[PDB]
Write a protein that binds this ligand. Structure first.
Ligand SMILES: OCCN(CCO)CCO
Ligand SMILES: O=C([O-])C(=O)[O-]
Ligand SMILES: O=C([O-])C(=O)[O-]
Ligand SMILES: [Cl-]
Lengths: 232, 231
């Protein structure tokens, strides 16, 4: 499997025998979906980033308010066999051959996250056609470099060191329910293509048993999942 | 920001469950660059080009970890535990930023060199005969997403602190270790990479950094300098 996906909160702070250089144990996200996708060669970009860079979009539906969202881009994936309970697989990814899945294409991901204009599941597809909301991380956030399995995180402002101090937090400081768009691109000589897995993790405040995010590269299909999600 | 922390197998902490690993105390990151078409140092699986990295370990250790990452991109000013090869330095940024493979097959084989001035010649001889454990022969055929190949002692205690009470004969021996690395098609061993080599010493035992080089003669020069230095 993939490496564990960790929030920015520190669970333990054990100072290693003698050496003042210490070891902080991060708290893992309680709710993680790994989305396995595939960008076919010459596939048109979903959009443009930084003027001229080909960007591709994933859409995430977050149904309750959260403490944090973490996003990791790993590529390529190779074959993974039968997906597990935490895994989702794109059609393109299914149809892709083992060889196709095992070809590397890029390494450093520029990730942008933007909240879209959608108060309700049923606005998702039009929200996707619409401009993002025009503030803090739950409206806009960008990490221009993501290498070696690092994350892009959407955080509340002024987060405490102790995860447990989120018990106290005011609702109005938490990240809002809604539709978020992940844009990803790269730098030459890389190009965004082939297999990849976007791990998305949510952190809920202490005592709130989480719900999993819904994720899809297709806003109509996510919307159906989200429309169906709310009336089940 | 550099590389992820290189972790040993020893569990430092456990809780609510996910476990926190003890880092290696003595770590060196070897930034290298395999030139297009470069002749293999040897063959693996009847159809794979393998490349060799030589590690000298002067004293007994509790564990060694090897992580292979590729490509690296540009890295900025090398830090206090970074070795950077001339090939890597001569490579362009574009060259170091192109990926070429993602799944590494690693072997670690001990070579028959009891002292520094055997190193160069030992590299030319077969590995020590491989039960003999991890510190003679170890292989991990798949290393993806920054996973490690570890050379471990057999029947280790749960608690690292209990290593202070271990019999010496159980610890991993001093010597010359060859790291082989190759890959599966469609990838190929090409371009930039960083091999992170971590040592775990038993507690109370000050770490000594591993000496690492792709050229055994060069490694031998360094091992020799280090040894005669200690008188
Ligand atoms: O062609 C199949 C051989 N295969 C190794 C088996 O996993 C790929 C190596 O390049
Ligand atoms: O296939 C996919 O999932 C994509 O295009 O992002
Ligand atoms: O650059 C190097 O040292 C190599 O190929 O191992
Ligand atoms: Cl010894």
């Amino acid at each position: 499997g993939l490496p564990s996906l960790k929030s920015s909160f520190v669970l333990s702070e054990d100072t290693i025998p003698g050496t003042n250089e210490t070891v902080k144990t991060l708290l893992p996200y309680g709710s993680v979906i790994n989305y396995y996708g595939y960008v076919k060669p010459g596939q048109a970009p979903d959009g443009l980033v930084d003027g001229n860079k080909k960007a591709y979009y994933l859409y995430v539906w977050i149904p309750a308010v959260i403490a944090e969202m973490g996003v990791r881009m790993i590529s390529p994936t190779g074959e993974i066999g039968e997906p597990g309970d935490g895994d989702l697989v794109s059609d393109a990814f299914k149809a892709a051959t083992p060889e196709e899945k095992s070809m590397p294409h890029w390494f450093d991901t520029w990730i942008r996250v933007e909240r879209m204009s959608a108060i309700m599941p049923d606005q998702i597809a039009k929200a996707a056609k619409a401009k993002p909301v025009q503030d803090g991380d739950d409206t806009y956030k960008e990490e221009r470099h993501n290498k070696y399995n690092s994350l892009t995180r959407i955080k509340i402002p002024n987060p405490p060191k102790s995860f447990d101090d989120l018990k106290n937090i005011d609702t109005k400081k938490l990240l809002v329910r809604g539709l978020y768009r992940i844009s990803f691109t790269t730098y030459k000589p890389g190009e965004v293509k082939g297999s990849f897995v976007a791990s998305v993790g949510l952190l809920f405040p202490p005592g709130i048993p989480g719900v999993s995010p819904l994720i899809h590269s297709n806003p109509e299909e996510l919307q159906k999942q989200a429309i169906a999600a709310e009336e089940s």
